[PDB]
Amino acid sequence: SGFRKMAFPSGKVEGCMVQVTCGTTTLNGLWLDDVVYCPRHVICTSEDMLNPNYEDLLIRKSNHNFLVQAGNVQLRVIGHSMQNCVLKLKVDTANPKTPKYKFVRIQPGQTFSVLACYNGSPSGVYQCAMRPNFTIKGSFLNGSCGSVGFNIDYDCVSFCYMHHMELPTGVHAGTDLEGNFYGPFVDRQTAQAAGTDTTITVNVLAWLYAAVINGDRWFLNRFTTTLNDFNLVAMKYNYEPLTQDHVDILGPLSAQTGIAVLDMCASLKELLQNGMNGRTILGSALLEDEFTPFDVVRQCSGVT
Amino acid sequence: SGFRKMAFPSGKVEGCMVQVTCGTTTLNGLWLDDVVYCPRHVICTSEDMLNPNYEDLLIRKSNHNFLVQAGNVQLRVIGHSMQNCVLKLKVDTANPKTPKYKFVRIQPGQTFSVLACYNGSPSGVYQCAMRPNFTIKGSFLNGSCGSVGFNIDYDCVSFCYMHHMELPTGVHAGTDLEGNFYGPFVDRQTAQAAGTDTTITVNVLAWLYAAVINGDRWFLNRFTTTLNDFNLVAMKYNYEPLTQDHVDILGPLSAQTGIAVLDMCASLKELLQNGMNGRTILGSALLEDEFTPFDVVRQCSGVT
Numbered sequence: 375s376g377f378r379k380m381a382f383p384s385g386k387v388e389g390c391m392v393q394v395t396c397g398t399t400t401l402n403g404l405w406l407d408d409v410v411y412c413p414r415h416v417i418c419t420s421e422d423m424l425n426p427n428y429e430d431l432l433i434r435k436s437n438h439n440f441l442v443q444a445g446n447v448q449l450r451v452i453g454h455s456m457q458n459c460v461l462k463l464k465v466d467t468a469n470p471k472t473p474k475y476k477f478v479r480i481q482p483g484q485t486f487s488v489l490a491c492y493n494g495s496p497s498g499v500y501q502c503a504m505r506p507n508f509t510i511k512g513s514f515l516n517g518s519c520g521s522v523g524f525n526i527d528y529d530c531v532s533f534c535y536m537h538h539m540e541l542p543t544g545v546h547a548g549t550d551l552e553g554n555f556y557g558p559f560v561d562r563q564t565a566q567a568a569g570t571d572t573t574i575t576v577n578v579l580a581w582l583y584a585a586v587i588n589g590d591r592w593f594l595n596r597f598t599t600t601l602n603d604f605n606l607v608a609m610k611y612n613y614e615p616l617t618q619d620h621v622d623i624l625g626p627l628s629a630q631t632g633i634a635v636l637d638m639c640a641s642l643k644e645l646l647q648n649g650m651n652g653r654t655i656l657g658s659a660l661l662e663d664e665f666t667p668f669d670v671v672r673q674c675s676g677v678t
Numbered sequence: 679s680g681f682r683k684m685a686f687p688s689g690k691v692e693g694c695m696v697q698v699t700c701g702t703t704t705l706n707g708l709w710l711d712d713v714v715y716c717p718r719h720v721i722c723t724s725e726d727m728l729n730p731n732y733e734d735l736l737i738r739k740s741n742h743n744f745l746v747q748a749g750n751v752q753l754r755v756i757g758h759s760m761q762n763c764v765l766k767l768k769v770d771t772a773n774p775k776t777p778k779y780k781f782v783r784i785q786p787g788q789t790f791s792v793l794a795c796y797n798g799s800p801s802g803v804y805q806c807a808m809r810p811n812f813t814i815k816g817s818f819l820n821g822s823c824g825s826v827g828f829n830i831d832y833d834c835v836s837f838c839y840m841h842h843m844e845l846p847t848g849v850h851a852g853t854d855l856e857g858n859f860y861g862p863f864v865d866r867q868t869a870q871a872a873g874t875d876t877t878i879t880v881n882v883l884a885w886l887y888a889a890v891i892n893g894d895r896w897f898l899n900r901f902t903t904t905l906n907d908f909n910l911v912a913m914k915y916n917y918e919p920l921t922q923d924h925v926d927i928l929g930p931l932s933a934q935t936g937i938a939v940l941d942m943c944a945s946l947k948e949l950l951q952n953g954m955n956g957r958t959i960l961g962s963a964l965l966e967d968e969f970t971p972f973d974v975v976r977q978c979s980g981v982t
């Protein structure tokens with residue numbers, strides 16, 4: 375029993391982290407096979423970042439300008455290319471610690487672990503969700519760029535995120551491993567609206583099921599609701615509309631607890647309308663949306 | 679910016695996890711050098727656990743009865759001994775992945791990362807605190823015994839906790855790596871009181887400083903207090919008394935923000951007496967006590 379914001383074991387990703395330096399800028403890279411992936415803004419100086427022409431800035435750089443270091447050993451760069459907002463530095467040595475991996479584009483509302491790095495060295499690991507507005511509420515300082523987000527399925531690491539920047543609002547933006555930003559963001563120091571965020575309804579319901587499984591049940595009531603009635607409440611409280619696909623994804627948790635999804639929606643409706651009244655759920659005084667239904671089953675079943 | 683419940687990168691610990699089986703019981707072990715450490719209750723059957731005589735139960739076991747497996751390879755056991763509540767299985771092979779390590783006994787109120795394991799395989803990593811009452815509020819299922827808690831300082835892993843059991847209250851108990859339980863607990867299936875827990879005052883103040891650094895400042899007020907006046911409030915709200923040693927440990931955060939420790943205590947006093955009024959701090963609607971002053975500085979400075 376117990377329910378924690380659990381990250382994946384980071385070992386397989388730690389073995390891929392390297393330091394990339396170009397000119398006076400140092401950030402993290404991801405060494406997989408004979409390629410090092412890193413944010414393309416490594417080639418910018420502070421003046422460049424206001425309105426960079428990346429194609430022009432990259433043309434002034436040669437293979438020998440990209441200093442790549444894995445621990446204490448230097449990697450020899452034999453190629454460089456830009457794909458969207460990432461640079462791919464071909465090196466003459468395949469990473470011996472390359473795990474089985476995939477590059478995936480996660481959907482908003484999905485979760486992943488972040489291995490925060492500085493100077494190619496891992497500092498910490500935490501679990502977070504890709505917000506509905508495509509930002510992440512991470513914990514990153516200057517030098518953390520190139521730190522990655524990932525999920526692990528047995529022995530396969532699915533890389534889904536590479537850190538690029540912090541918006542003036544304090545939230546974070548980045549790309550998939552093909553360099554495509556999540557959200558409307560550009561790698562430029564200019565005004566950027568993140569847009570309205572919403573609470574991830576299916577994750578809140580999953581976490582309410584996690585609460586029931588772990589013994590916190592005070593919020594269960596004698597009521598039920600319909601998808602339409604629930605969605606009127608979700609609208610008022612800036613929650614994502616719940617669809618039948620979400621109800622279906624909650625199937626396993628509904629079967630495990632014997633609490634119909636619409637009955638759990640009625641519990642959520644009452645908590646949204648009445649608040650917690652000073653009570654807590656799984657150690658939280660607010661409704662948690664960073665656990666997907668998959669995360670709840672995985673944590674409550676101990677998948678390794 | 680941003681503030682997360684960040685765990686240490688778990689790689690160095692993942693390389694030490696092995697599976698230990700004795701009879702019909704399987705749990706995790708920690709392989710460091712040529713010794714595998716695991717909870718001694720691995721030698722118990724379900725009947726034994728109500729009132730086990732560990733000395734007698736261990737006498738019926740020989741080296742060949744302890745099956746130790748590291749991934750797919752079997753380790754050869756050449757010795758066994760019980761030290762307090764842990765078994766030390768001497769193996770004929772030193773763990774090639776043994777990191778630089780120490781065995782430490784943490785103080786209540788200190789934090790550490792837990793690498794939850796099942797069948798010697800890592801499932802997840804999370805950060806938690808040793809409660810003032812010497813329990814941990816973890817996330818553990820059956821089979822998780824032998825999973826360890828640790829802290830990392832550059833390249834040295836300080837192991838502080840080994841998981842042994844879950845109390846009927848849903849909280850967790852375990853030992854240091856010399857097999858000494860934290861708290862009054864015994865490795866027996868009998869009624870066990872954890873005793874009154876308290877909120878870790880110095881950690882709450884550290885987290886309030888983390889909030890100020892990251893931009894959440896609404897709770898700062900025009901007031902100050904004294905250690906004595908603050909401790910009257912801490913008493914009423916089941917918070918640990920704040921000492922001058924705690925004020926001294928908060929020195930760096932006080933200097934970083936320019937907010938005197940007693941002024942921060944006055945902010946905490948007002949939040950304790952008035953609540954949050956429906957507002958949040960660092961994404962939390964309650965006062966967080968799982969970050970030590972050291973954790974706040976480390977996360978806010980990006981130490982690797």
Ligand SMILES: COc1cccc(Oc2cc(Cl)cc(NC(=O)Cc3cncc4ccccc34)c2)n1
Pocket residue numbers: 415423514515516517518519538539540541542560561562563564565566679
């Ligand atoms: C003015 O609005 C914006 C909006 C989006 C971006 C912006 O500037 C940019 C543009 C580019 Cl190309 C890269 C960056 N790099 C970073 O933000 C680096 C970084 C990452 N994480 C945490 C950090 C904490 C503190 C300091 C820096 C951090 C910024 N300005």
Ligand SMILES: COc1cccc(Oc2cc(Cl)cc(NC(=O)Cc3cncc4ccccc34)c2)n1
Pocket residue numbers: 375719727818819820821822823842843844845846864865866867868869870
């Ligand atoms: C009846 O009171 C108690 C108090 C303390 C212990 C007790 O029983 C004991 C005594 C011993 Cl020696 C070992 C154990 N082992 C465990 O608790 C194993 C375990 C660990 N973590 C999470 C778990 C979740 C679900 C099931 C088992 C879990 C229990 N009973």
